[PDB]
């Protein structure tokens, strides 16, 4: 009953590429260095604005529209930080040693020390971005991975329809690797390598969620009502 299952692999790729959200900018104030309140303000303001575009992207992910409102809410509440972080890691891939939060907000690990307890998260994010660069991750592979996160991360906290869509995304990832000229063995090895990184992305989100929770409790930064609700979903 879902249109997503009749899509071919090329149609799935084209749908995800067309769904991509825009790259937002940070505020243009050149005042350096950042304080802890200043940097957490920039990072949360950017994340808050990116969340609006994520909702639009998610509704364009094949199969997401066929879910009920409650199921859509659940998947997004579960994966929202994972989704921002894989996009961040993707944007930073061509910038070794740096995190491109935005085109005018390119930070290194030392600037991660501007906020207490974030340098550990910066390092994990940087190691993930380097891993993607060393794998020569392609944009077509990236959009498949980000969609997998959306559909999978909350699927075992509720499913048949979702699992069939996830299967469709796996076929699409394999088809891209076959199209690049990989052997069958190289195809499943690479598929495993990418999916295992999603375990690390989940770890980074969980650490980032506890870090964001502490910033709210420590009243470091004003968090938007949207962010407070997305954060409150993780208890």
């Amino acid at each position: 009953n879902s249109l997503a299952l009749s899509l071919t692999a090329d149609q799935m790729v084209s749908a995800l590429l067309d769904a991509e959200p825009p790259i937002l900018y940070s505020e243009y104030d050149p005042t350096r260095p950042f304080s802890e309140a200043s940097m957490m303000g920039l990072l949360t303001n950017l994340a808050d604005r990116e969340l609006v575009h994520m909702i639009n992207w998610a509704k364009r992910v094949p199969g997401f529209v066929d879910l009920t409102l409650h199921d859509q809410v659940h998947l997004l509440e579960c994966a929202w930080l994972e989704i921002l972080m894989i996009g961040l890691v993707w944007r930073s891939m061509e910038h070794p040693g740096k995190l491109l939060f935005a085109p005018n907000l390119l930070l290194d690990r030392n600037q991660g020390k501007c906020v207490e307890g974030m340098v550990e998260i910066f390092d994990m994010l940087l190691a993930t971005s380097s891993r993607f660069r060393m794998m020569n991750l392609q944009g077509e592979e990236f959009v498949c991975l980000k969609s997998i996160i959306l559909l999978n991360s909350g699927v075992y906290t509720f499913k048949d329809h979702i699992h069939r869509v996830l299967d469709k995304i796996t076929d699409t990832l394999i088809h891209l690797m076959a199209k690049a000229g990989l052997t069958l063995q190289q195809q499943h090895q690479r598929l495993a390598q990418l999916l295992l990184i999603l375990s690390h992305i989940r770890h980074m989100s969980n650490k980032g969620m506890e870090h964001l929770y502490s910033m709210k409790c420590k009243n470091v930064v004003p968090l938007s009502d949207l962010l407070l609700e997305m954060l409150d979903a993780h208890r």
Partner: peptide, 13 residues
């Protein structure tokens, strides 16, 4: 109201 995420998904463009 209830959830901001509710209004965002219902008004998604």
């Amino acid at each position: 109201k209830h959830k901001i995420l509710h209004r965002l998904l219902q008004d998604s463009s």
